[PDB]
Amino acid sequence: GLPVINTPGSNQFLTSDDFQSPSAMPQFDVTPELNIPGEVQNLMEIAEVDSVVPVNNVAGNLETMDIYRIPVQSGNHQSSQVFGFQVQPGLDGVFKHTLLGEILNYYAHWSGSIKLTFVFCGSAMATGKFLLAYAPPGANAPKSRKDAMLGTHIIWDVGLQSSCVLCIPWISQTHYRLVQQDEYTSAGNVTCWYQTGIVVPAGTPTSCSIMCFVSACNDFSVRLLKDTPFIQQAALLQ
Amino acid sequence: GLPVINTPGSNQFLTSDDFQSPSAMPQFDVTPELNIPGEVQNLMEIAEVDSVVPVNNVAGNLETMDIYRIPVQSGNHQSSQVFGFQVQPGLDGVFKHTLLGEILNYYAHWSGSIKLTFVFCGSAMATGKFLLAYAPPGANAPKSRKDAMLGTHIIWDVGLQSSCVLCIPWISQTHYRLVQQDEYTSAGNVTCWYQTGIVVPAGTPTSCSIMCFVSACNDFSVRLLKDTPFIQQAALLQ
Amino acid sequence: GAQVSTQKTGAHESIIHYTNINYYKDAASNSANRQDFTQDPGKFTEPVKDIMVKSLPALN
Amino acid sequence: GAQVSTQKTGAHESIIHYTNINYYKDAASNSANRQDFTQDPGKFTEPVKDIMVKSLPALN
Amino acid sequence: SDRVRSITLGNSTITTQESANVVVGYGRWPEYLRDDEATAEDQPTQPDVATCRFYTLESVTWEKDSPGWWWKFPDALKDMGLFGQNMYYHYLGRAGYTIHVQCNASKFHQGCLLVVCVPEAEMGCSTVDGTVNEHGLSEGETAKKFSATGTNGTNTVQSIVTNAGMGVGVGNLTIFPHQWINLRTNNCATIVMPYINNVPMDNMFRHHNFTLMIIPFVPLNYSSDFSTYVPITVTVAPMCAEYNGLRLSTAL
Amino acid sequence: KSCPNPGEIRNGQIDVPGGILFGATISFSCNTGYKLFGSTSSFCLISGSSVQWSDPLPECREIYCPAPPQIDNGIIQGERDHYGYRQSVTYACNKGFTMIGEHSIYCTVNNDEGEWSGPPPECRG
Amino acid sequence: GDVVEAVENAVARVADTIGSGPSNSQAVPALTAVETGHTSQVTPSDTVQTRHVKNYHSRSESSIENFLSRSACVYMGEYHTTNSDQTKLFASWTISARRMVQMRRKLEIFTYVRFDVEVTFVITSKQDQGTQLGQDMPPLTHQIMYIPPGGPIPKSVTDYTWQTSTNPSIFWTEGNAPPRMSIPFISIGNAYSNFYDGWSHFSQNGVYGYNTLNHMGQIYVRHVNGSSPLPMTSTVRMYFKPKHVKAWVPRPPRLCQYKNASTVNFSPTDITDKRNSITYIPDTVKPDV
Amino acid sequence: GDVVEAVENAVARVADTIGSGPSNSQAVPALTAVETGHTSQVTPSDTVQTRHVKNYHSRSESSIENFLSRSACVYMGEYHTTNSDQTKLFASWTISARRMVQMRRKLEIFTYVRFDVEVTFVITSKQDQGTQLGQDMPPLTHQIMYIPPGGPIPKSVTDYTWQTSTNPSIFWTEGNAPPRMSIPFISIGNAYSNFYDGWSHFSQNGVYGYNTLNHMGQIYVRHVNGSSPLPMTSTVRMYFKPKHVKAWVPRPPRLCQYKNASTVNFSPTDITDKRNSITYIPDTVKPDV
């Protein structure tokens, strides 16, 4: 008999342990592996894929394709801001059910730059320039184009290239932010404004839609696994 | 199955044990280390720093800046001893709440030489010489300058060098003394006397204060960890 | 006949490795491959024949 | 793949060492570093630019 | 002599004919944030001279019974020229400082001041089960005053000098960077503090990186010395200031 | 708009929970061992063209205990006047007597008034 | 590499931020054509001036292995020590990960998965409530038995079938560590299929979906002491920790709640939560409104 | 070296006493200027004649690691096996080392600290007092569950939440060794901060101090047998042993007693104890007076 001392922990069952265990089927000949296309290896591969953001998540659009359309139009509306939203990828309605959002919800920490792609869906004869701005935290949301252009921004010219990318660089006091974001880990907002109205020739629709896609950049990562708030049940036979 | 015998001790929880244990967070990516100034490595680094001794810990000074001032003055006061105190760094009121003292109270044994720095805070036109004496145990505290000068001492001349250091060399039958000192581990006393009064020109204050700082020398160490007598509670939500 | 590989690095910027021996006859009995970290976003973010250089128009 | 280092010396002025093997995948699981004894009092007792030789006046 | 000394930052220079030494942080001189220590990704602004220079705060009077004074730090310089403007416009900031406390008297005066920089000096409330005010904590330039007795009042700091508003022994404040101003030998104190925090950068309004405390341990005294007025003046200069996360200015 | 900076109360505290704009109220208190003389709060109001505080800052004042009690057959050591907060008085018994009790008492504050701490000692022959 | 091995180096570092300065050219990285079905590869340095950042962040915890490899309850049932029902004397179900949602939604993020499984059982017993409660029952010993499709099925707690001459069984006594074992990749196919847009019958009818592909047998568990003077009841909980994983063709995470175990059925549900207007951004940073 | 490794040589010897003889010079080591903020480096040999002493004393036990690395109770709470309150059926707190003073004063000697933590739990149960005391309850099995900030919180001892598909949990049965596990350095920042002279809101208000920086989640613990005919009650005690430590900017040890957990609040307290006079030194060495 070799002398032994059992340490605290002996006989416990830790959900996330990682030990060897006897097989109940000695020598089972597993069926050969088959090379299926589309192998996934890290959930970040999924978060790096664009998915459509429901920016227009206003009461009444919650179950209609509108929630995905940002309304924009011909005529003088400069004072009128096109849209705006908080940058809380795992928490605010605008993002939480997004491909990036659903993934963030299985973790408690995130870090990285985010890509917001905007695509114009008006007629080809339509024209226009928009100002896409991102404001790091510390002040309230810009209330005018003047205030918004003092932060990070691109001026998007609608043309043959239907899409424009506003990249939100990671600017934070800490290396990570809570997915369940609080004021301490605030990330700011992005707002959009007419830089020079939408002009259009006769015979074409005077209003169209802009769509918005989100995805993670390559400096993005997440930590600390946890369960999602999004799924539940009252009983078995689930 | 490899033969084994459990020895006494198996399954106990010893506060000061030192074993490996499973991590409840496999592969957690810890945040990068940052080089902060002021890294501490051994509590002795703290004990080696001077801190002000409350020598005048007389009733009524316990909550006023006086407890830190040793009164000294012009005129004939030679017979009058300036101050005196026991050398029990972790026990006597004069030392226990000192930087050196607070540290000693987390241990049961100490050993080493001690530095007592005295700084004169009278006007620059003030003058004077003091006799700082340390008497190893075995007799009662010197009752006169005659008796005090027979022991270890420096004669301090007030001048541009505002401070003087009386170093208490380690003289003991044993290598260590109890922080909770008893007569068996007695360390003696230090007393101070006018060597030649305080002389001053006209127009200047006839009385001033001398402050006293304590710190450990480089031959100082402590052993046998224990809890401090100084902190407590009656209930939780502490 | 054992294997030594490195531990995931913790609380600081040789004793940072562990040893393992397999005691069972089936690979199924082994512990998880928590240390394999490959990646290929491409399958999904860019499955277009005709390489998109993107610094160039993308159309035209 | 184990490590052998010396024990803290006890009750007397080769068998004074021990061996250790890490069984876990995370550094957090390891035992304490009770044997590291560095020191730098300077940060605190002497944070003065202009080196004080002290055997010399210190002022003047 | 080594009592003589001059310091120049930006368009400003300080001189002394009676200095002790110069204390440096925990032995660390200020440095700008390195790439392998950074998280905020945007390019920093480093105003340099416009910002890293000597700002002098409003002076205080040392009276025969003054308990002491204190100032919180990044806040306190918030209205000082471009250093303050850069504070208002950025979310994150980082800086070191050269602090120079000035107090001259005469060979016939006496007294002794402890001058300390306490990193992270969280203070306690007067009302034991209440909480402080930002006002009870700092008044920008000016300076809060310690007190000789226990204080009351909701929101104010329990300021009896004896416990330094932190619940410790004031006479142990020496583990922090500091110098003493002993009138008989010295007429100023100079401490260079490096940025100290548990994160590489931080917001300068929300967090008081450190507190400067001037506490007289031996009180001011003199005779027919037709000089009863003995002021103390604090001059400080940000060093290596860098800012990140630019946007509209913060709401006063 | 806003009232001027409240300032500071010597040996006291000013609480400013709701800013210093018109309509704001600030509150005053004294440190332990000091008593408040004057108003305990001030309101920021508009009067003609000035925005000003309704009430000035109060004074926080200290306190002397009364002369210490005499004890039969003992003496107060070094008796003098003006025993302020935290100062103490000590006693000794006369030749022929022995003391029982605390040899010293302290000046404390109770309800804004100076009062001697514990009971004085007794001297027994 | 070999996805069956319990060791394999390499740090999963994210990308460094390349230092970027001012630009005036024909380069137009921020302008792409989303119609192509390609996701833009723009990084901060393509649209703003960036400093250089040596980024040490790793994606270790989002690797498929670390995401799925944590034991999850996939089933729970009860059985009594004593009763008149015979049936209530043992528990039995049909193996699947479709009865508890958490685990199910995790797996369903992938269309196909292949892996070994570490099964851990947590068994507990309680004494049933009653007027007389005093008894001295020795420790309970349970028997868990796996019946591959086609094996004879127990009809009572004392059926010959529990002889397990061949089915694998686990005997365990209360008070000890929970029972556990590994099961290899057991599919008839090359990967377990989480969705199947198909039928069981060639005539495009019969049963639709996941179920036709299942058939991994069932589990039966009973007490072995078989008795107790007063009634008692045990609950068996089974946990699955997949290990040595491989996954293919990711799909969106289930949005609507699950309605039952055999189907993918759901009720129409909201895309996300509403907010006031398309420009609504709450005002934080105010002297508290 | 690497402060993550469980081994590292070198003796921490103090200084030898250099032999010193008589002197008559301009050297004046015993005269310094404390105003500079420098602590004198004088040793006995600079002020008295000393012999040479080869000193073997080491500072091993005062190394930061050996000073903090001893398990300390940082919390204790109770929960019942059975009760009408539902709430009293499980215990829960918010992780922090601020509720028991001993540990707290030790940590607070440093402004910032970084370390892994060995958590050990001591759980005990007692049978509640009552008129009828006879029952035969099997061994109690407990469940300790950690809920990182943001996870769903249990609302009863039988909430779905205890499924821990992802939160880490420990199941343990009485009579065995106390449960234990290591937790890595979990901060959002580069070091845990023990003091924070700051606010949560940018407008210099909100919550002040340590609390705004906390947020490390909470712990929930419940019985799993869930029953007992007669009432019983358990007490859970949690111990923290930091290991692999680093500490910065030391500060004075807390002098005034602590008033509560969320603040640094205190009442004015004495600098030290009084004594008779500034010259009072008791007379030992007398034929006993």
Coordinates of C-alpha atoms in Angstrom, one line a residue, chain C residues 16-47:
Chain C
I16 CA 4.7 26.8 -16.1
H17 CA 4.0 23.3 -17.3
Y18 CA 2.3 20.0 -16.4
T19 CA 2.7 16.4 -17.1
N20 CA 0.0 13.9 -18.2
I21 CA -0.2 10.0 -18.6
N22 CA -3.2 8.2 -20.1
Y23 CA -4.4 5.3 -18.1
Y24 CA -7.2 4.0 -20.4
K25 CA -7.3 1.9 -23.6
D26 CA -9.7 4.1 -25.5
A27 CA -9.2 7.6 -26.8
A28 CA -12.7 8.4 -25.6
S29 CA -11.5 8.2 -22.1
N30 CA -9.0 11.0 -22.5
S31 CA -9.5 14.5 -21.2
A32 CA -10.6 17.4 -23.4
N33 CA -8.4 19.3 -26.0
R34 CA -8.8 22.6 -24.4
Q35 CA -5.4 23.7 -25.7
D36 CA -6.0 23.5 -29.5
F37 CA -6.6 27.1 -30.8
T38 CA -6.8 27.1 -34.7
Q39 CA -9.1 29.4 -36.7
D40 CA -10.3 30.0 -40.2
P41 CA -13.0 32.9 -40.4
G42 CA -12.7 32.8 -44.2
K43 CA -15.1 29.9 -44.8
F44 CA -17.7 32.3 -43.6
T45 CA -16.5 35.9 -43.8
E46 CA -15.4 36.0 -47.5
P47 CA -16.6 32.8 -49.3

